[PDB]
């Protein structure tokens, strides 16, 4: 019954997820894995269904990690969905500054894919700006992809001076 829950959470079927999650006894089916190691929390956050991920948090789910170290907030910021992002941020705050296997945070992905409101949402909260495995900040990773709107909304922010301070003198790429 794991594959119907993965299909119903991967496409925003809220009533099918309510009918599958009536038995509140066994939570081993709720936090189960995938072939690529994704919980239904990860699938519901990847496609950007806020009510499904709110239901899975209300029933009780654990912020596990992908095989590549991603989180639900990493998928929601890779997609640029502000609603699931806002729900995950309103539940907990200890999941924001979280690293993947490559050292990227969620703000790195939200700036790499060029989502302005996602960057503004993680930036209005405390984002804990850190470098990459290749010593790249999120501002570097936005400038190399020529994303005009996200670097403009970094400039319009209040954290801009702080965003200017951090880089690597030794790194030949992010000069």
């Amino acid at each position: 019954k794991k594959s119907p829950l993965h299909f119903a959470a991967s496409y925003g079927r809220i009533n099918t997820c309510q009918r599958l999650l009536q038995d509140i006894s066994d939570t081993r089916l709720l936090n189960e894995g995938d072939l690529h190691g994704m919980t239904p929390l990860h699938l519901a956050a990847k496609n950007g269904h806020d009510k499904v991920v709110q239901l899975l948090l209300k029933k009780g789910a654990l912020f596990l990690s992908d095989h590549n170290g991603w989180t639900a907030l990493h998928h929601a910021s890779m997609g640029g969905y502000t609603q699931t992002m806002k729900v995950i941020l309103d539940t907990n705050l200890k999941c924001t500054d979280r690293l993947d296997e490559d050292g990227n945070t969620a703000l790195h992905f939200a700036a790499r894919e060029g989502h302005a409101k996602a960057v503004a949402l993680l930036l209005s909260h405390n984002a804990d700006i850190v470098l990459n495995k290749q010593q790249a900040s999120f501002l570097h990773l936005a400038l190399h992809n020529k994303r005009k709107e996200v670097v403009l909304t970094i400039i319009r922010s209040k954290r801009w001076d702080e965003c200017l301070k951090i880089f690597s003198h030794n790194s030949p790429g992010n000069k």
Partner: peptide, 16 residues
């Protein structure tokens, strides 16, 4: 609109 179609679609005899 297409994602809304899949969200509201009725699936019988194609599940699991």
């Amino acid at each position: 609109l297409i994602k809304l179609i899949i969200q509201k679609m009725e699936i019988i005899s194609e599940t699991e």
